[PDB]
Amino acid sequence: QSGFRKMAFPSGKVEGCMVQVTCGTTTLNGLWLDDVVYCPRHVICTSEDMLNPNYEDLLIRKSNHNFLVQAGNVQLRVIGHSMQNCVLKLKVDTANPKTPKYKFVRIQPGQTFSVLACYNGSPSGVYQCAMRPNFTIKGSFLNGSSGSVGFNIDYDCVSFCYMHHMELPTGVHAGTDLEGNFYGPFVDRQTAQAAGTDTTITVNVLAWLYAAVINGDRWFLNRFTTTLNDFNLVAMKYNYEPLTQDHVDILGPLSAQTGIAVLDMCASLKELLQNGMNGRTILGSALLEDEFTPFDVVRQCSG
Amino acid sequence: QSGFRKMAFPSGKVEGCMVQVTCGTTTLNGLWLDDVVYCPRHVICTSEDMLNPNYEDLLIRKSNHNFLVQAGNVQLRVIGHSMQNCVLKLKVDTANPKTPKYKFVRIQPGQTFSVLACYNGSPSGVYQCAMRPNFTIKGSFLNGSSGSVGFNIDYDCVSFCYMHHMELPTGVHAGTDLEGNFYGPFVDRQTAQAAGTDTTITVNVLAWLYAAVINGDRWFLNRFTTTLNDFNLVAMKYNYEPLTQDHVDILGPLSAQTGIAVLDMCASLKELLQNGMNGRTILGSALLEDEFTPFDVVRQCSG
Numbered sequence: 001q002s003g004f005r006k007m008a009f010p011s012g013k014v015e016g017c018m019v020q021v022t023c024g025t026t027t028l029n030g031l032w033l034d035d036v037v038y039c040p041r042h043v044i045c046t047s048e049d050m051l052n053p054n055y056e057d058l059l060i061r062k063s064n065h066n067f068l069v070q071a072g073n074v075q076l077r078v079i080g081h082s083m084q085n086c087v088l089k090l091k092v093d094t095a096n097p098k099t100p101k102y103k104f105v106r107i108q109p110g111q112t113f114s115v116l117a118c119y120n121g122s123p124s125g126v127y128q129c130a131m132r133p134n135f136t137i138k139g140s141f142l143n144g145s146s147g148s149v150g151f152n153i154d155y156d157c158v159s160f161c162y163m164h165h166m167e168l169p170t171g172v173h174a175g176t177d178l179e180g181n182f183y184g185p186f187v188d189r190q191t192a193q194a195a196g197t198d199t200t201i202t203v204n205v206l207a208w209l210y211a212a213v214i215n216g217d218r219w220f221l222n223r224f225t226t227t228l229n230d231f232n233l234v235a236m237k238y239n240y241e242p243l244t245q246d247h248v249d250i251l252g253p254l255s256a257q258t259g260i261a262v263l264d265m266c267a268s269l270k271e272l273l274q275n276g277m278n279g280r281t282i283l284g285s286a287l288l289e290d291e292f293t294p295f296d297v298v299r300q301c302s303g
Numbered sequence: 304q305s306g307f308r309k310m311a312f313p314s315g316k317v318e319g320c321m322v323q324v325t326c327g328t329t330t331l332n333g334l335w336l337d338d339v340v341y342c343p344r345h346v347i348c349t350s351e352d353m354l355n356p357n358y359e360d361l362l363i364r365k366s367n368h369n370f371l372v373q374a375g376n377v378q379l380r381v382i383g384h385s386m387q388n389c390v391l392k393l394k395v396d397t398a399n400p401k402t403p404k405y406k407f408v409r410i411q412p413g414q415t416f417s418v419l420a421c422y423n424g425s426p427s428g429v430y431q432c433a434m435r436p437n438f439t440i441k442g443s444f445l446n447g448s449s450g451s452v453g454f455n456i457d458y459d460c461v462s463f464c465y466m467h468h469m470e471l472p473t474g475v476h477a478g479t480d481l482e483g484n485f486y487g488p489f490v491d492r493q494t495a496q497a498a499g500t501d502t503t504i505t506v507n508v509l510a511w512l513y514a515a516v517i518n519g520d521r522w523f524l525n526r527f528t529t530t531l532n533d534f535n536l537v538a539m540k541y542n543y544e545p546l547t548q549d550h551v552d553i554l555g556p557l558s559a560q561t562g563i564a565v566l567d568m569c570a571s572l573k574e575l576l577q578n579g580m581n582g583r584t585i586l587g588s589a590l591l592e593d594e595f596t597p598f599d600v601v602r603q604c605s606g
């Protein structure tokens with residue numbers, strides 16, 4: 001409302017990195033940077049292996065010739081392979097001439113990133129996601145989507161933070177950083193696993209209330225202030241993450257761009273949690289939105 | 304197969320086309336396809352020209368060298384110019400080597416597309432939009448955003464459908480097709496203009512209810528049916544667009560897939576409007592979503 005919506009990074013730099021990886025009858029997406037392809041290690045599994053894989057043993061059994069990597073029409077010859085945690089690394093005969101400036105970063109719950117959904121190494125769609133407090137993401141992922149990556153771009157530098165591995169029974173998604181470390185208490189085995197009970201990202205809700213004010217949505221503002229302690233007692237009651245002093249400092253700018261003190265805005269949110277929204281919406285939403293970071297609000301508004 | 308998200312097309316093919324166009328102190332974006340840069344003609348207005356510009360009189364006073372066109376840090380030499388409706392076409396000395404397979408299409412209200420928001424010829428972010436029934440879009444556009452484009456990329460062809468020109472007093476946006484013809488009764492003049500009252504895109508709400516069913520949710524169905532006439536008589540009391548026999552025909556495939564007759568889903572929507580969601584959500588929304596088309600739903604849930 002008044003010009004504020006979920007925005008993904010332009011995906012071009014990542015599009016030029018997606019490849020298809022095939023091991024026997026198992027196909028998924030790979031990330032091609034320089035002369036290495038990164039993909040989920042579960043590509044080395046047949047359907048039955050996935051039910052209870054011995055990744056050490058399945059990798060000893062494989063050779064370079066067991067991996068087919070396709071970049072558009074061109075087969076890349078695999079000349080080496082290794083595992084790092086839950087990602088397979090395939091050394092190829094050819095460095096990606098579209099490799100962007102990049103790094104691998106591991107993000108914290110509450111942080112947002114752009115997902116390039118891919119199938120058969122072909123980019124399909126882009127959308128914004130937040131790492132939930134329970135380490136899941138609310139993605140849109142079908143069969144063959146594994147190896148799709150999540151990223152942020154700063155100037156010309158792509159920061160890769162997510163590689164897609166699996167779908168939990170609630171329909172939410174679990175994955176790794178690009179070093180193959182899982183976000184959350186999940187394993188790359190087709191076995192009964194479940195998302196923990198989710199919590200709301202308090203600092204992101206406050207950020208979005210700041211976005212509402214900057215966009216002229218002020219009905220929820222009030223004369224009242226509060227303390228972290230009273231507010232955190234409300235937060236806890238309503239399955240909201242504790243608000244930390246560090247969260248307040250991060251919101252500092254917006255507290256000035258709007259001249260409303262975080263603990264002043266905390267009074268609005270407490271009131272909204274206690275008394276609800278009263279038929280009114282905020283930036284077009286009837287729900288309190290927690291998938292915009294303070295950075296995201298500034299990026300989109302002040303940017 | 305439970306996750307559903309507003310998903311944009313991967314933007315790489317359009318990113319390679321975005322340039323900066325400057326005339327005097329006025330800078331905005333251009334679309335560089337082969338040896339032509341397409342941009343809003345209002346780049347040739349000064350501060351003084353905004354209320355009642357005569358574009359024919361402003362343009363005839365310009366030389367090729369008055370147009371500064373920048374592709375990254377490379378200056379493109381303008382060797383020609385013409386005006387077509389509200390678009391300027393700048394002939395440059397260099398065909399864009401990144402030109403994708405493209406066409407120009409004029410869309411109807413209800414149609415969706417991806418927007419690549421740009422500033423100074425630099426892509427900023429990508430989001431999904433729909434042409435509203437009142438010929439506006441609910442975009443997120445700031446100063447310098449004019450000449451940002453809307454597109455689809457069904458089947459490796461980029462279809463350019465929108466070029467951004469202006470913001471209306473309610474915060475909605477107005478622009479042209481790539482032939483420079485405005486969507487709606489708008490003019491590229493800082494004259495008192497206002498969006499017509501807007502309506503909800505009924506065929507799209509129904510598509511998204513079909514999406515909810517495909518992804519395993521049916522709580523909102525009921526034992527009733529409706530005539531098309533009775534559906535429209537109720538829906539228009541909630542500011543919904545009339546549903547046409549064309550709309551019913553368009554929903555046929557989604558009807559067939561789910562086993563829910565179009566007019567039975569219509570009966571469900573009539574009850575949804577009457578009752579609200581009673582604390583429930585549909586694909587994570589507390590509101591009825593109208594910016595997914597029947598075609599978008601088949602894209603994301605299947606192909």
Ligand SMILES: *C(=N)[C@H](C[C@@H]1CCNC1=O)NC(=O)[C@@H]1[C@@H]2[C@H](CN1C(=O)[C@@H](NC(=O)C(F)(F)F)C(C)(C)C)C2(C)C
Pocket residue numbers: 028042050141142143144145146147165166167168169173187188189190191192193304
């Ligand atoms: C990668 N190509 C897919 C992506 C999945 C498929 C549908 N939606 C997605 O996001 N990854 C998998 O199929 C992984 C893979 C085996 C099983 N699996 C799952 O995602 C399964 N989920 C789980 O087993 C659970 F619940 F533990 F998360 C499935 C039931 C097929 C959705 C491996 C190795 C974990």
Ligand SMILES: *C(=N)[C@H](C[C@@H]1CCNC1=O)NC(=O)[C@@H]1[C@@H]2[C@H](CN1C(=O)[C@@H](NC(=O)C(F)(F)F)C(C)(C)C)C2(C)C
Pocket residue numbers: 331345348353444445446447448449450468469470471472476490491492493494495496
């Ligand atoms: C292109 N760079 C901008 C994009 C605008 C700026 C703010 N948000 C946007 O979408 N285009 C313009 O500034 C156009 C341009 C003169 C004025 N204008 C407007 O968008 C203005 N609005 C209108 O005149 C109105 F209400 F009629 F739509 C403005 C008040 C600056 C928002 C011209 C030639 C229309």
